[PDB]
Short mmCIF file of all heavy atoms in Angstrom, two decimals:
data_model
loop_
_atom_site.label_atom_id
_atom_site.label_comp_id
_atom_site.label_asym_id
_atom_site.label_seq_id
_atom_site.Cartn_x
_atom_site.Cartn_y
_atom_site.Cartn_z
N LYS A 14 -48.87 211.86 -125.99
CA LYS A 14 -48.76 211.72 -124.52
C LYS A 14 -49.18 210.31 -124.10
O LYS A 14 -48.50 209.68 -123.27
CB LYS A 14 -49.56 212.78 -123.74
CG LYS A 14 -49.68 212.55 -122.27
CD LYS A 14 -48.36 212.57 -121.56
CE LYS A 14 -48.50 212.22 -120.06
NZ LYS A 14 -47.13 212.29 -119.45
N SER A 17 -46.64 207.49 -124.50
CA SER A 17 -45.36 207.67 -123.82
C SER A 17 -45.31 206.90 -122.48
O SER A 17 -44.28 206.98 -121.77
CB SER A 17 -45.10 209.18 -123.55
OG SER A 17 -45.96 209.58 -122.53
N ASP A 84 -40.76 195.24 -133.76
CA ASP A 84 -41.15 196.60 -133.97
C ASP A 84 -41.98 197.10 -132.80
O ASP A 84 -42.58 196.31 -132.07
CB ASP A 84 -41.77 196.78 -135.35
CG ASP A 84 -40.77 196.63 -136.46
OD1 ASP A 84 -39.79 197.47 -136.53
OD2 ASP A 84 -40.88 195.62 -137.15
N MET A 114 -41.43 191.71 -116.93
CA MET A 114 -42.40 191.19 -116.03
C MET A 114 -42.25 192.01 -114.72
O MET A 114 -41.23 192.06 -114.08
CB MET A 114 -42.31 189.72 -115.72
CG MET A 114 -43.52 189.16 -114.91
SD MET A 114 -43.43 187.45 -114.80
CE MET A 114 -42.26 187.17 -113.38
N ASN A 139 -31.38 201.84 -113.59
CA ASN A 139 -30.43 200.92 -114.21
C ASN A 139 -30.94 200.55 -115.67
O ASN A 139 -30.92 199.43 -116.03
CB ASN A 139 -30.30 199.64 -113.42
CG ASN A 139 -29.32 198.67 -114.01
OD1 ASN A 139 -28.29 199.11 -114.52
ND2 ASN A 139 -29.60 197.39 -114.01
N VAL A 150 -30.82 188.31 -123.90
CA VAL A 150 -31.86 187.29 -123.86
C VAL A 150 -32.64 187.26 -125.18
O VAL A 150 -32.92 186.19 -125.71
CB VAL A 150 -32.81 187.52 -122.64
CG1 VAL A 150 -34.06 186.56 -122.71
CG2 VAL A 150 -32.12 187.34 -121.33
N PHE A 166 -40.87 184.32 -123.32
CA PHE A 166 -39.76 184.84 -122.58
C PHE A 166 -40.15 186.09 -121.78
O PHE A 166 -41.05 186.87 -122.15
CB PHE A 166 -38.64 185.18 -123.51
CG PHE A 166 -38.11 184.06 -124.36
CD1 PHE A 166 -38.78 183.59 -125.49
CD2 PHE A 166 -36.98 183.31 -123.95
CE1 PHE A 166 -38.31 182.50 -126.26
CE2 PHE A 166 -36.55 182.22 -124.72
CZ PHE A 166 -37.22 181.88 -125.88
N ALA A 198 -46.52 175.37 -118.83
CA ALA A 198 -47.96 175.54 -118.44
C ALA A 198 -48.40 174.38 -117.53
O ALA A 198 -49.28 174.57 -116.69
CB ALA A 198 -48.83 175.74 -119.67
N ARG A 211 -21.83 186.26 -121.37
CA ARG A 211 -22.12 187.54 -121.97
C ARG A 211 -22.50 187.39 -123.47
O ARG A 211 -23.17 188.26 -124.02
CB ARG A 211 -21.06 188.57 -121.65
CG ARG A 211 -21.29 189.16 -120.26
CD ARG A 211 -20.12 190.10 -119.80
NE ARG A 211 -20.54 191.13 -118.81
CZ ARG A 211 -20.44 191.17 -117.47
NH1 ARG A 211 -20.16 190.11 -116.83
NH2 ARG A 211 -20.71 192.28 -116.82
N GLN A 221 -31.39 174.90 -126.16
CA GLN A 221 -31.22 173.75 -127.04
C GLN A 221 -31.61 172.46 -126.28
O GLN A 221 -32.38 171.57 -126.78
CB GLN A 221 -29.84 173.77 -127.66
CG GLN A 221 -29.67 172.83 -128.82
CD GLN A 221 -30.63 173.16 -130.00
OE1 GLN A 221 -30.55 174.21 -130.60
NE2 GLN A 221 -31.59 172.29 -130.25
#
Side-chain angles (χ1 to χ4, degrees):
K14 173 59 185 182
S17 72
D84 292 295
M114 188 174 82
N139 180 41
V150 171
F166 297 82
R211 281 173 152 95
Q221 194 63 64

